[PDB]
Amino acid sequence: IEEGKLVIWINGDKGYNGLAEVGKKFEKDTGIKVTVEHPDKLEEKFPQVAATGDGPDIIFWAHDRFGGYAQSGLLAEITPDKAFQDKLYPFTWDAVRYNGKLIAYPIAVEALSLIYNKDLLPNPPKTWEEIPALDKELKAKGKSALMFNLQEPYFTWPLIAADGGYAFKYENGKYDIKDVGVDNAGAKAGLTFLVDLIKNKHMNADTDYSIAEAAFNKGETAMTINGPWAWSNIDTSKVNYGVTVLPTFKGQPSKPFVGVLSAGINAASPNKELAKEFLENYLLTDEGLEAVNKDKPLGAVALKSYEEELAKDPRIAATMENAQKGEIMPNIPQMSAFWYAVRTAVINAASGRQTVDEALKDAQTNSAMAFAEDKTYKYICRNFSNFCNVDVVEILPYLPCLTARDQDRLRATCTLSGNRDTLWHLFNTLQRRPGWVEYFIAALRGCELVDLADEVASVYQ
Ligand SMILES: OC[C@H]1O[C@H](O[C@H]2[C@H](O)[C@@H](O)[C@@H](O[C@H]3[C@H](O)[C@@H](O)[C@@H](O[C@H]4[C@H](O)[C@@H](O)[C@@H](O)O[C@@H]4CO)O[C@@H]3CO)O[C@@H]2CO)[C@H](O)[C@@H](O)[C@@H]1O
């Protein structure tokens, strides 16, 4: 990472050109060049490159990713004084507080809304259940009722959660990792309804972000589901649109997962004070946020002074109405595994590779497995010295989850670097492999390391 400049990563659906304008003004005042980038998969690349001390100085994503980054030591603790904290809504700071520390700056609150074409549909439906018949009628004039992105579970979550789906149960001050709601009756009813929409040819399983967007902005579909960032493309299309509350399902509100766009500082950045100055004194001002918002709308901003004006816009009131009905996402490290499991479930059920019941059963099983394995791997790392009696060569015969290639590599590592150094690689390789914990417990018992085996079983439970 280069000292004396700032490199920023933000998602390609956000106003990165407006952000670049804030960076130019920063450069004008400070002499520090700001490069804004929107890499593909930046939220997956970040933890890869940052672990090795590279990456951007500043990373923007919704807050659900940041607990995972913070647990890995990838983020600097942010240090706004009390006066600056006072500028932003307390509930937005709560989104970026992880184990008692502020780990990012909150930018804006995002919730999905129903966006509809007033010329095709002056009175949008209050319920999901009326969408099939509306589509049939619209199909008669060469249009459709509703298209939205079916490739990302974020857009389908509001419907899965409506009748009772949830990610993690919050109870007694904490999210319960072992109480997960993706395979209860409410979750199945929501996904079943979506699957039925597809089975009945009211939607297409491969509709994605760009397909849904093009159709809506060209007047071909009467409704879409999207967030505030999509509004400026609709503005330039001259579709006459409204933004309103999501349709209800089974008489209950759709419950979108609410994201706080947040900006974290790379723990490896040599430019932490400059990054703090940029974020506090340039971005989180009326002018900084205006510049970004004018490019792609941010949603309900964290900055009170600016939000007082945005709150007067019906599209923002609708956003916050949908937010009230949904839930702020957890920022916990288990969030990414939850989302991966739900993505697979929705795509498998929509495409017909699995029934809804198969798809959600696997989502529940596979996410619980992920949480438990990640926790065990984290425990092995923090307690490495407990495991330094483990002899890599002795343990390999009991680890059939390792491929022949894994075994040869580990042998070579052992030859070049010794057993202790190889143990780290052993654990790192195991955790990328299916069913590793059971076999690792077995392998420890096979080597007569019963207390160690029991200690692993205990953490994995
Ligand atoms: O399965 C391979 C795919 O994996 C990658 O996507 C993952 C992410 O890495 C996870 O973080 C998660 O994504 C969440 C996201 O964290 C969450 O904030 C929300 O994202 C919204 C966002 O808040 C909003 O601002 C706007 O940009 O839309 C986003 C959704 O498109 O919801 C996401 C889940 O949909 O899970 C996904 C897996 O779904 C990788 O990037 C993919 O390319 C890859 O196919």
Numbering used by the authors: 2 to 462
Source paper text:
IPS-1/MAVS/VISA/Cardif is an adaptor protein that plays a crucial role in the induction of interferons in response to viral infection. IPS-1 (as it will be referred to from hereon) is a 62 kDa protein containing an N-terminal CARD domain, a proline-rich region and a transmembrane domain that targets it to the outer mitochondrial membrane. The proline rich region interacts with a number of signalling molecules including TRAF6, TRAF2, RIP1, FADD and TRAF3, suggesting that IPS-1 plays a role in TLR3-mediated pathways in addition to TLR-independent, RIG-I/MDA5-mediated signalling. It has also been demonstrated that both the IPS-1 CARD and C-terminal mitochondrial membrane-targeting domains of IPS-1 are essential for IFN-β induction.
The 3 amino acid linker forms a helix that connects the final helix of MBP to the first helix of IPS-1 CARD. IPS1-CARD exhibits the characteristic topology of the DD superfamily, comprising six tightly packed α-helices arranged in a Greek-key motif. Helix 1, often severely kinked in CARD structures, is divided into two smaller helices: H1a, from residues 4 to 14 and H1b, which is a short 310 helix encompassing residues 16 to 19. Helix 2 in IPS-1 CARD is truncated relative to the other known CARDs, a feature which is accompanied by a shortening of the loop interconnecting H2 and H3. By contrast, H3 is about 6 residues longer in IPS-1 CARD relative to the other CARD structures with H3 and H4 connected by only a single glycine residue. On the opposite side of the molecule, a negatively charged patch covers the surfaces helices H2 and H6 and their preceding loops.
